[PDB]
mmCIF file of C-alpha atoms (C1' of nucleotides) and ligand atoms in Angstrom:
data_model
loop_
_atom_site.group_PDB
_atom_site.id
_atom_site.type_symbol
_atom_site.label_atom_id
_atom_site.label_comp_id
_atom_site.label_asym_id
_atom_site.label_seq_id
_atom_site.Cartn_x
_atom_site.Cartn_y
_atom_site.Cartn_z
ATOM 1 C CA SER A 262 -47.532 -14.179 -44.204
ATOM 2 C CA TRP A 263 -48.034 -10.542 -43.278
ATOM 3 C CA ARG A 264 -50.410 -8.222 -45.076
ATOM 4 C CA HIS A 265 -48.073 -5.230 -45.177
ATOM 5 C CA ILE A 266 -50.419 -2.255 -45.032
ATOM 6 C CA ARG A 267 -48.553 0.652 -46.582
ATOM 7 C CA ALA A 268 -49.056 4.199 -47.831
ATOM 8 C CA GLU A 269 -47.529 7.660 -47.403
ATOM 9 C CA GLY A 270 -46.384 7.637 -43.762
ATOM 10 C CA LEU A 271 -48.483 4.551 -43.025
ATOM 11 C CA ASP A 272 -46.601 1.450 -41.909
ATOM 12 C CA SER A 273 -48.537 -1.509 -40.538
ATOM 13 C CA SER A 274 -48.785 -5.286 -40.790
ATOM 14 C CA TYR A 275 -51.573 -7.802 -40.214
ATOM 15 C CA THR A 276 -51.418 -11.539 -39.495
ATOM 16 C CA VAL A 277 -53.407 -14.343 -37.881
ATOM 17 C CA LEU A 278 -51.720 -15.738 -34.766
ATOM 18 C CA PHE A 279 -54.324 -18.227 -33.633
ATOM 19 C CA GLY A 280 -56.651 -20.676 -35.313
ATOM 20 C CA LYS A 281 -60.306 -20.787 -34.262
ATOM 21 C CA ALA A 282 -60.152 -23.299 -31.392
ATOM 22 C CA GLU A 283 -57.271 -21.554 -29.575
ATOM 23 C CA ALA A 284 -58.625 -18.069 -30.252
ATOM 24 C CA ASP A 285 -62.026 -19.143 -28.833
ATOM 25 C CA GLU A 286 -60.468 -20.476 -25.612
ATOM 26 C CA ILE A 287 -58.346 -17.309 -25.179
ATOM 27 C CA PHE A 288 -61.416 -15.132 -25.729
ATOM 28 C CA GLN A 289 -63.417 -17.154 -23.170
ATOM 29 C CA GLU A 290 -60.563 -16.715 -20.726
ATOM 30 C CA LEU A 291 -60.407 -12.964 -21.384
ATOM 31 C CA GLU A 292 -64.175 -12.728 -20.811
ATOM 32 C CA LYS A 293 -63.836 -14.779 -17.642
ATOM 33 C CA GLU A 294 -60.820 -12.974 -16.160
ATOM 34 C CA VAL A 295 -60.495 -9.349 -17.338
ATOM 35 C CA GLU A 296 -61.547 -6.487 -14.987
ATOM 36 C CA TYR A 297 -62.746 -3.210 -16.547
ATOM 37 C CA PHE A 298 -62.797 0.290 -15.058
ATOM 38 C CA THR A 299 -66.108 1.962 -14.161
ATOM 39 C CA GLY A 300 -67.434 5.414 -13.201
ATOM 40 C CA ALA A 301 -64.685 8.038 -12.787
ATOM 41 C CA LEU A 302 -62.084 5.922 -14.600
ATOM 42 C CA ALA A 303 -64.305 5.379 -17.653
ATOM 43 C CA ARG A 304 -64.932 9.033 -18.552
ATOM 44 C CA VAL A 305 -62.890 11.140 -20.992
ATOM 45 C CA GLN A 306 -62.749 14.848 -21.862
ATOM 46 C CA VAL A 307 -63.163 15.762 -25.540
ATOM 47 C CA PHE A 308 -64.101 19.108 -27.125
ATOM 48 C CA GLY A 309 -64.687 20.627 -23.685
ATOM 49 C CA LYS A 310 -67.082 17.884 -22.564
ATOM 50 C CA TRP A 311 -66.878 14.751 -20.397
ATOM 51 C CA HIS A 312 -68.372 11.485 -21.669
ATOM 52 C CA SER A 313 -68.620 7.872 -20.620
ATOM 53 C CA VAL A 314 -66.608 5.892 -23.157
ATOM 54 C CA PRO A 315 -68.795 3.955 -25.622
ATOM 55 C CA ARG A 316 -67.072 0.629 -24.766
ATOM 56 C CA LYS A 317 -65.175 -0.823 -21.803
ATOM 57 C CA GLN A 318 -61.491 -0.221 -20.962
ATOM 58 C CA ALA A 319 -58.857 -1.924 -18.794
ATOM 59 C CA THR A 320 -55.104 -1.517 -18.257
ATOM 60 C CA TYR A 321 -52.538 -4.122 -17.199
ATOM 61 C CA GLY A 322 -48.755 -3.670 -16.990
ATOM 62 C CA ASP A 323 -45.617 -3.296 -14.866
ATOM 63 C CA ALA A 324 -46.251 -1.440 -11.582
ATOM 64 C CA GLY A 325 -45.502 2.293 -11.455
ATOM 65 C CA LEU A 326 -46.509 2.998 -15.053
ATOM 66 C CA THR A 327 -49.553 5.099 -16.010
ATOM 67 C CA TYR A 328 -51.195 5.849 -19.355
ATOM 68 C CA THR A 329 -53.005 9.140 -19.960
ATOM 69 C CA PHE A 330 -55.251 10.065 -22.902
ATOM 70 C CA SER A 331 -58.059 12.595 -23.429
ATOM 71 C CA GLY A 332 -57.907 13.851 -19.822
ATOM 72 C CA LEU A 333 -57.975 10.373 -18.250
ATOM 73 C CA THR A 334 -55.122 8.599 -16.394
ATOM 74 C CA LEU A 335 -55.091 4.797 -16.081
ATOM 75 C CA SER A 336 -52.997 2.767 -13.626
ATOM 76 C CA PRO A 337 -52.016 -0.784 -14.540
ATOM 77 C CA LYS A 338 -53.406 -3.781 -12.712
ATOM 78 C CA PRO A 339 -50.782 -6.514 -12.154
ATOM 79 C CA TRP A 340 -50.392 -8.969 -15.070
ATOM 80 C CA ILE A 341 -52.498 -12.145 -15.205
ATOM 81 C CA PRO A 342 -51.590 -15.543 -16.783
ATOM 82 C CA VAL A 343 -53.710 -15.053 -19.937
ATOM 83 C CA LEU A 344 -52.282 -11.602 -20.811
ATOM 84 C CA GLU A 345 -48.672 -12.678 -20.274
ATOM 85 C CA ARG A 346 -49.399 -15.700 -22.455
ATOM 86 C CA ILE A 347 -50.470 -13.301 -25.242
ATOM 87 C CA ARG A 348 -47.695 -10.759 -24.610
ATOM 88 C CA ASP A 349 -45.010 -13.482 -24.524
ATOM 89 C CA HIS A 350 -46.356 -14.937 -27.748
ATOM 90 C CA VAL A 351 -46.606 -11.610 -29.592
ATOM 91 C CA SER A 352 -43.082 -10.860 -28.356
ATOM 92 C CA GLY A 353 -41.910 -14.177 -29.798
ATOM 93 C CA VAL A 354 -43.345 -13.497 -33.259
ATOM 94 C CA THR A 355 -42.123 -9.876 -33.445
ATOM 95 C CA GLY A 356 -38.860 -9.812 -31.474
ATOM 96 C CA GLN A 357 -40.483 -6.783 -29.817
ATOM 97 C CA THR A 358 -41.059 -6.261 -26.095
ATOM 98 C CA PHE A 359 -43.976 -4.792 -24.097
ATOM 99 C CA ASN A 360 -44.693 -3.561 -20.561
ATOM 100 C CA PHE A 361 -48.326 -2.434 -20.856
ATOM 101 C CA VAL A 362 -51.662 -3.376 -22.390
ATOM 102 C CA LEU A 363 -54.827 -1.360 -22.877
ATOM 103 C CA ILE A 364 -57.866 -3.563 -23.335
ATOM 104 C CA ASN A 365 -60.958 -2.377 -25.152
ATOM 105 C CA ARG A 366 -64.169 -4.426 -25.123
ATOM 106 C CA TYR A 367 -66.954 -3.538 -27.540
ATOM 107 C CA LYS A 368 -70.091 -5.366 -26.397
ATOM 108 C CA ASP A 369 -71.562 -5.135 -29.916
ATOM 109 C CA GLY A 370 -71.433 -3.042 -33.100
ATOM 110 C CA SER A 371 -72.783 0.005 -31.235
ATOM 111 C CA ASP A 372 -69.707 0.208 -29.066
ATOM 112 C CA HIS A 373 -66.890 1.993 -30.885
ATOM 113 C CA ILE A 374 -63.859 4.234 -30.586
ATOM 114 C CA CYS A 375 -63.649 7.626 -32.256
ATOM 115 C CA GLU A 376 -61.029 8.747 -34.709
ATOM 116 C CA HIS A 377 -57.754 9.503 -32.931
ATOM 117 C CA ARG A 378 -53.983 9.231 -32.860
ATOM 118 C CA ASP A 379 -51.889 7.402 -30.287
ATOM 119 C CA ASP A 380 -49.584 10.403 -29.923
ATOM 120 C CA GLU A 381 -49.116 10.293 -26.131
ATOM 121 C CA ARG A 382 -45.780 11.309 -24.607
ATOM 122 C CA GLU A 383 -45.280 8.262 -22.355
ATOM 123 C CA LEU A 384 -44.869 5.821 -25.288
ATOM 124 C CA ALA A 385 -41.238 5.048 -26.112
ATOM 125 C CA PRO A 386 -40.335 6.750 -29.421
ATOM 126 C CA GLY A 387 -40.122 4.500 -32.498
ATOM 127 C CA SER A 388 -41.451 1.396 -30.741
ATOM 128 C CA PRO A 389 -44.591 -0.284 -32.162
ATOM 129 C CA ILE A 390 -48.117 -0.928 -30.855
ATOM 130 C CA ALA A 391 -49.405 -4.516 -30.985
ATOM 131 C CA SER A 392 -53.149 -4.833 -31.582
ATOM 132 C CA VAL A 393 -54.555 -8.269 -30.907
ATOM 133 C CA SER A 394 -58.253 -8.944 -31.409
ATOM 134 C CA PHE A 395 -60.744 -11.591 -30.258
ATOM 135 C CA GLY A 396 -64.441 -12.300 -30.752
ATOM 136 C CA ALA A 397 -66.488 -10.555 -33.405
ATOM 137 C CA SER A 398 -64.655 -9.282 -36.466
ATOM 138 C CA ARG A 399 -64.777 -5.472 -36.650
ATOM 139 C CA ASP A 400 -63.690 -2.896 -39.201
ATOM 140 C CA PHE A 401 -60.635 -0.812 -38.427
ATOM 141 C CA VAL A 402 -60.244 2.429 -40.364
ATOM 142 C CA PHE A 403 -57.094 4.402 -41.148
ATOM 143 C CA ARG A 404 -57.600 8.007 -42.285
ATOM 144 C CA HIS A 405 -54.812 10.404 -43.279
ATOM 145 C CA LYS A 406 -54.567 13.566 -41.152
ATOM 146 C CA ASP A 407 -54.630 16.106 -44.013
ATOM 147 C CA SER A 408 -57.482 14.333 -45.844
ATOM 148 C CA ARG A 409 -60.322 15.810 -43.751
ATOM 149 C CA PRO A 410 -59.611 19.367 -46.707
ATOM 150 C CA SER A 411 -56.011 19.771 -47.905
ATOM 151 C CA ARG A 412 -55.059 16.322 -49.273
ATOM 152 C CA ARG A 413 -57.249 13.910 -51.304
ATOM 153 C CA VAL A 414 -55.514 10.803 -49.838
ATOM 154 C CA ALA A 415 -57.820 7.775 -49.569
ATOM 155 C CA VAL A 416 -58.903 5.813 -46.507
ATOM 156 C CA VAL A 417 -57.574 2.353 -45.640
ATOM 157 C CA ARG A 418 -59.971 -0.085 -43.982
ATOM 158 C CA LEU A 419 -59.649 -3.715 -42.959
ATOM 159 C CA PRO A 420 -61.532 -6.243 -40.841
ATOM 160 C CA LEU A 421 -59.670 -7.241 -37.698
ATOM 161 C CA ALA A 422 -60.422 -10.924 -37.298
ATOM 162 C CA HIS A 423 -60.793 -13.160 -34.281
ATOM 163 C CA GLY A 424 -57.227 -14.109 -33.319
ATOM 164 C CA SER A 425 -55.515 -11.449 -35.436
ATOM 165 C CA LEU A 426 -52.506 -9.234 -34.809
ATOM 166 C CA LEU A 427 -52.193 -5.735 -36.230
ATOM 167 C CA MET A 428 -48.772 -4.128 -35.792
ATOM 168 C CA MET A 429 -48.697 -0.339 -35.801
ATOM 169 C CA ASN A 430 -45.206 0.916 -36.505
ATOM 170 C CA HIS A 431 -43.625 4.345 -36.996
ATOM 171 C CA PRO A 432 -44.596 6.884 -38.315
ATOM 172 C CA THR A 433 -48.127 5.386 -38.563
ATOM 173 C CA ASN A 434 -49.375 7.171 -35.397
ATOM 174 C CA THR A 435 -47.730 10.490 -36.349
ATOM 175 C CA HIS A 436 -49.573 10.922 -39.681
ATOM 176 C CA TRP A 437 -52.675 8.704 -39.634
ATOM 177 C CA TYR A 438 -55.788 8.627 -37.467
ATOM 178 C CA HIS A 439 -57.618 5.406 -36.693
ATOM 179 C CA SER A 440 -61.065 4.382 -35.460
ATOM 180 C CA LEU A 441 -63.366 1.410 -34.919
ATOM 181 C CA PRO A 442 -66.620 2.722 -36.391
ATOM 182 C CA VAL A 443 -70.151 1.738 -35.398
ATOM 183 C CA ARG A 444 -71.339 -1.412 -37.154
ATOM 184 C CA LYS A 445 -74.997 -1.813 -36.211
ATOM 185 C CA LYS A 446 -75.311 -5.346 -37.688
ATOM 186 C CA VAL A 447 -72.594 -6.757 -35.410
ATOM 187 C CA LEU A 448 -74.280 -8.409 -32.411
ATOM 188 C CA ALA A 449 -71.331 -10.211 -30.760
ATOM 189 C CA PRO A 450 -68.703 -8.759 -28.379
ATOM 190 C CA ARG A 451 -65.083 -8.047 -29.394
ATOM 191 C CA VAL A 452 -62.036 -7.740 -27.111
ATOM 192 C CA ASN A 453 -58.999 -5.850 -28.290
ATOM 193 C CA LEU A 454 -55.569 -5.687 -26.706
ATOM 194 C CA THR A 455 -53.099 -2.943 -27.550
ATOM 195 C CA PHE A 456 -49.723 -3.917 -26.148
ATOM 196 C CA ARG A 457 -47.511 -0.879 -25.721
ATOM 197 C CA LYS A 458 -44.060 0.221 -24.548
ATOM 198 C CA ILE A 459 -44.498 2.929 -21.852
ATOM 199 C CA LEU A 460 -41.878 5.028 -20.010
ATOM 200 C CA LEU A 461 -41.605 7.395 -16.994
ATOM 201 C "C1'" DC B 177 -58.477 36.047 -45.306
ATOM 202 C "C1'" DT B 178 -55.717 32.886 -42.393
ATOM 203 C "C1'" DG B 179 -52.687 29.567 -34.616
ATOM 204 C "C1'" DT B 180 -53.370 24.196 -33.702
ATOM 205 C "C1'" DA B 181 -55.433 20.085 -31.216
ATOM 206 C "C1'" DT B 182 -59.449 17.836 -29.351
ATOM 207 C "C1'" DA B 183 -60.127 8.690 -28.195
ATOM 208 C "C1'" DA B 184 -66.838 12.307 -28.001
ATOM 209 C "C1'" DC B 185 -71.214 14.117 -29.519
ATOM 210 C "C1'" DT B 186 -75.429 15.817 -32.026
ATOM 211 C "C1'" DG B 187 -77.170 17.118 -36.520
ATOM 212 C "C1'" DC B 188 -77.453 16.229 -40.618
ATOM 213 C "C1'" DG B 189 -77.974 13.958 -45.707
ATOM 214 C "C1'" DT C 161 -77.338 2.394 -41.689
ATOM 215 C "C1'" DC C 162 -73.199 4.898 -42.702
ATOM 216 C "C1'" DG C 163 -70.440 8.754 -42.636
ATOM 217 C "C1'" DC C 164 -69.192 13.335 -42.502
ATOM 218 C "C1'" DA C 165 -69.419 18.538 -40.512
ATOM 219 C "C1'" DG C 166 -69.017 21.058 -36.710
ATOM 220 C "C1'" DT C 167 -67.737 21.376 -32.629
ATOM 221 C "C1'" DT C 168 -65.022 23.744 -27.558
ATOM 222 C "C1'" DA C 169 -69.197 22.365 -19.373
ATOM 223 C "C1'" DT C 170 -60.920 24.216 -23.786
ATOM 224 C "C1'" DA C 171 -55.604 23.739 -23.375
ATOM 225 C "C1'" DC C 172 -52.165 25.294 -25.168
ATOM 226 C "C1'" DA C 173 -47.516 27.176 -28.234
HETATM 227 O O1 LIG D 71 -60.099 -1.652 -30.535
HETATM 228 C C1 LIG D 71 -59.248 -1.467 -31.429
HETATM 229 O O2 LIG D 71 -59.058 -2.313 -32.323
HETATM 230 C C2 LIG D 71 -58.428 -0.192 -31.465
HETATM 231 C C3 LIG D 71 -58.104 0.346 -30.074
HETATM 232 C C4 LIG D 71 -57.332 1.654 -30.138
HETATM 233 O O3 LIG D 71 -57.260 2.339 -31.150
HETATM 234 C C5 LIG D 71 -56.647 2.120 -28.942
HETATM 235 O O4 LIG D 71 -56.711 1.431 -27.906
HETATM 236 O O5 LIG D 71 -56.011 3.198 -28.993
HETATM 237 MN MN1 LIG D 72 -55.603 4.037 -30.757
#
DNA sequence: CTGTATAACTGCG
DNA sequence: TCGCAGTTATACA
């Protein structure tokens, strides 16, 4: 069963890949194994200013690729068993294929990611983004671009659960912005993996 | 009377 | 606590 999230120019789907016990073990592995960028490679440029990102970020993928957003370029670290395990699985369930993963770790509800689009040039056109989540459940919010105001279109929000998979298809990232807002009452960490298809 | 776009923030309310 | 407005130690088209 897929919760088919749909609206005007919004095409996404949500399912639960892993039960609790497996999801726990994968999370513990991710916590044990994943290496996040620091300093220079953890700062972005937005509205003329540089900031440390209010979370942690890592990139893994096939050598030679790079991903650039908001004035920052990230080079992939070579794949590790646990990420390939997740990629290979996601690929099985979707028939889709991936060469890159951005990992975001939100230590608690005060870590977040601001409203944005994944509109970057180096993503293959048409091809989806695979968002896999572990740890604390957090709210994910979809907001229409012309809502913020020319168009009264409503917001779509859903919890992303421990062991869940959110597919983001086309034209989702051409019309809708997304964010993971601050949730002060959340005390536990969350790890998110956005598997992507990059080219250059 | 009129350019858009901004993965983050402070300053509200 | 939550969210929304404005924004610009600017970069374009
Ligand atoms: O952490 C999430 O669930 C979303 C991450 C995201 O939007 C991104 O990596 O572009
Ligand atoms: Mn995104």
